[PDB]
Amino acid sequence: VQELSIERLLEMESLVADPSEEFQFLRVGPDSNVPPKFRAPVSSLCQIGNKQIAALVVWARDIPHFSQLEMEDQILLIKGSWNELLLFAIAWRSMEFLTEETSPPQLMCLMPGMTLHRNSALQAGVGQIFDRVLSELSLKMRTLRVDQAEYVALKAIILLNPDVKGLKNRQEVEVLREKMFLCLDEYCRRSRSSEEGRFAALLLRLPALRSISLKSFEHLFFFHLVADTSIAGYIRDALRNHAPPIDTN
Amino acid sequence: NVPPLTANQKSLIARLVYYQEGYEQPSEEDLKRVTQTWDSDMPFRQITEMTILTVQLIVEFAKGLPGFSKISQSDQITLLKACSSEVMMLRVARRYDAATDSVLFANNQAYTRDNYRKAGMAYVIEDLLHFCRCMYSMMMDNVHYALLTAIVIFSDRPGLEQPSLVEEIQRYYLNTLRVYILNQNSASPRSAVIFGKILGILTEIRTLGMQNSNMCISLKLKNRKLPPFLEEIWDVADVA
Ligand SMILES: C/C=C/CC/C=C\CC/C=C/CCCCCCC(=O)OC[C@H](COP(=O)(O)OCCN)OC(=O)CCCCCCC/C=C/C/C=C/CCC
Ligand SMILES: COc1cccc(C(=O)NN(C(=O)c2cccnc2OC)C(C)(C)C)c1C
Ligand SMILES: [Mg+2]
């Protein structure tokens, strides 16, 4: 029995998952309105998303007191957070590729080996989402000087959402999110004592992340890239069958 | 002990609760005017007519809000367009009756399960009722609710000319809510929890505001007549 804290969540970032089992959360599918010329690139990007979705489930599973939740609720929390947690990780990685400290940012870190260029997003018609990710999230967190402790705490608050529809034990999810609110306020008060609006400033990025996440689904569903009928089952099988994370000493 | 509320913050709280109570209920004179503009189409009319009236009350509340005059006219319309649907979700959720598990709007004829099922939007009311039950469990007083409403209006929206200015105005209401929760709870550790759960509503009303935009587009595709004031305030495209 361990305590849900920022210190434990920081240790969980070092753990790397073995994605030996792959689940097709995002796939091109038949009769795709994606032009065939760009169909192979979109499929590649979907397989990259699926890998990061799989590593996201392994991370959520080892969060303290997350396994003690009902398996129905564990599926619902990951089902309603994977898109927002993906964009939040993309924005966190994209902070390094920012221009300077009047041209808009041009690079976005899909993955450590990936940068999606702004012109490619404009051709795909997702340039508006592209810029919001880099401005409302990446650039704002650089201005807010967000460290990894606050970043991993916001990740837990995004996942542990008691307002998820269909939960069996809502109040069990509340206690975990309420504990993360206490951990976040304590870190903001001892580190940056002068900044008294930082606790709200960090949390004000979550509504911005939601609006961006919902807009991504509109493009994802318009191109029939999501298999929503099978996502709930993939998380169930990933929570049970995926191997424990590898550790870096 | 606990940092107290300043004279500016105590007056702002008293001002917000004062005017939000005046716009809780629509005016009887404006009640009959919006109906004279335009198979029964009665459930769809009552829901839209009450939405027009309540949105009009939201704009009047937002225009008389401290800081709304400091921003440009183009930024005023941008904030009014975005917060209209989301504040509507707070107005309706504020009138949730736990005993009957429904929305009691005194009129009690628009926001009902029966009118939404007859208007074809049977799936929508259950998503609204879930947000009503979730927000009802928070037990916000009129101060939490009024300060939250102002925080919604001065939120960072896409297409703002002066985002740094609106952010300073929003922070002026956030700190009022923060100190109010501190004095209310005697600086107990739970002050951040109550302050955090209120800020969590900002995230959830983004989804409901997005569902309203998708519903307005679906109604425009099915050739169902949406009122003109609601089509302009939310930028509903005349789509085929
Ligand atoms: C939150 C989850 C994140 C995981 C995202 C990973 C994979 C999902 C797919 C993402 C695609 C981003 C676009 C990358 C460029 C693709 C190559 C390209 O130039 O296509 C142009 C084409 C123009 O065609 P056309 O103009 O119709 O045809 C022209 C003539 N044939 O565009 C297309 O063919 C359609 C592409 C479908 C894009 C779906 C966007 C969904 C985005 C989700 C979140 C990511 C946001 C960052 C975006 C940069
Ligand atoms: C999740 O809840 C949703 C989701 C999607 C659409 C609606 C809706 O019914 N919206 N409409 C209203 O009149 C209305 C009623 C109550 C409150 N807010 C409203 O609008 C902001 C239409 C203009 C008729 C579409 C609602 C209530
Ligand atoms: Mg006022």
CA distances B181 to A118, A205, B175, B187, B225, Å, are 43, 21, 10, 8, 44
Please tell me if the CB atom of residue A220 comes closer than 6 angstroms to any atom of ligand 1: yes
Cβ distance B233 to B78 under 8 Å? no
Please tell me if the CB atom of residue A111 comes closer than 6 angstroms to any atom of ligand 1: no
Quote the crossing angle between the two packed helices A170-191 and A6-13, to the nearest 10°.
Answer: 90
Neighbours of A40 (CB within 10 A): 11
Cα B52–Cα B56–Cα B60 angle in degrees, nearest 5: 170
Cβ distance A93 to A133 under 8 Å? no
Q: CB contact, 8 Å: A208 with chain B?
A: yes
Cβ distance A247 to A15 under 8 Å? yes
Which residue of chain B comes nearest to A129, CA vs CA? B158
Neighbours of B137 (CB within 10 A): 15
Q: What is the resolution of this structure in A?
A: 3.0
Q: CB contact, 8 Å: A198 with chain B?
A: no
The DSSP letter of residue A245 is: P
How far is Cα B205 from Cα B79, in angstroms, rounded to an integer? 15
Which residue of chain B comes nearest to A160, CA vs CA? B200
Three-state SS for A2-36 is CCCCHHHHHHHHCCECCCCCCCCCECCCCCCCCCH
Give A57's contacts (C-beta < 8 A, 6+ positions apart).
A78, A82, A235, A238, A239, A242
Quote the crossing angle between the two packed helices B42-63 and B73-94, to the nearest 10°.
Answer: 120
How far is Cα B168 from Cα B153, in angstroms, rounded to an integer? 13
Residue nearest (by alpha carbon) to ligand 1 atom 45 = A216
Task: Flag if B156 and A208 touch (Cβ within 8 Å).
Answer: yes
How far is Cα B192 from Cα B198, in angstroms, rounded to an integer? 10
Task: Flag if A165 and B127 touch (Cβ within 8 Å).
Answer: yes
Structure tokens at A33: 């309105």
Residues followed by a break in chain A (C to N exceeding 2.5 Å) are 101
Q: CB contact, 8 Å: A165 with chain B?
A: yes
The residue type of B73 is Q
Task: Flag if B193 and A211 touch (Cβ within 8 Å).
Answer: no
How far is Cα B94 from Cα B237, in angstroms, rounded to an integer? 30
Structure tokens at A122: 């404009």
For tokens 């504020």, what's the residue? B94
Q: Of the candidates A203, A207, A211, which has its C-beta nearest B196's C-beta?
A: A203
Residues of B whose CB is below 8 A from A206: 199-200, 202-203
Centre of ligand 2 from the C-alpha of residue B111, in Å:
9
Q: Of the candidates B130, B156, B196, which has its C-beta nearest A181's C-beta?
A: B196
Q: Of the candidates B155, B174, B192, which has its C-beta nearest A181's C-beta?
A: B192
User: How big is chain A, counted in residues?
Assistant: 249
How far is Cα A18 from Cα A62, in angstroms, rounded to an integer? 14
- Reduced to 3 states (helix: H, G, I; strand: E, B; else coil), residue A226 is strand
Helices assigned H by DSSP within B34-102: 42-63, 73-94
Cβ distance B157 to B79 under 8 Å? yes
How far is Cα A73 from Cα A63, in angstroms, rounded to an integer? 14
CA atoms within 13 Å, Cβ hemisphere of A142: 17
What is the separation of C-alpha A171 from the centre of its chain, rounded to a whole number of angstroms?
23
Q: CB contact, 8 Å: B200 with chain A?
A: yes
Cβ distance A26 to A46 under 8 Å? yes
Count residue pairs from A and B with Cβ separation < 8 A.
68
Please tell me if the CB atom of residue A82 comes closer than 6 angstroms to any atom of ligand 1: no
Task: Flag if A208 and B193 touch (Cβ within 8 Å).
Answer: no
β-pairing verdict for B102-103 and B96-97: antiparallel
Which residue of chain B comes nearest to A206, CA vs CA? B203
Which residue of chain B comes nearest to A183, CA vs CA? B192
The DSSP letter of residue B65 is: S
Nearest-atom number in ligand 1 for the CA of A48 is 6
How far is Cα B19 from Cα B31, in angstroms, rounded to an integer? 19
Cα B105–Cα B106–Cα B111 angle in degrees, nearest 5: 35
Centre of ligand 1 from the C-alpha of residue A25, in Å:
16
Cβ distance A22 to A51 under 8 Å? yes
Task: Flag if B156 and A136 touch (Cβ within 8 Å).
Answer: yes
Residues of A whose CB is below 8 A from B156: 136, 204, 208
Task: Flag if B131 and A204 touch (Cβ within 8 Å).
Answer: no
Task: Spell B231-240 as b/e; 16+ CB within 10 A means b.
Answer: bebbebeeee
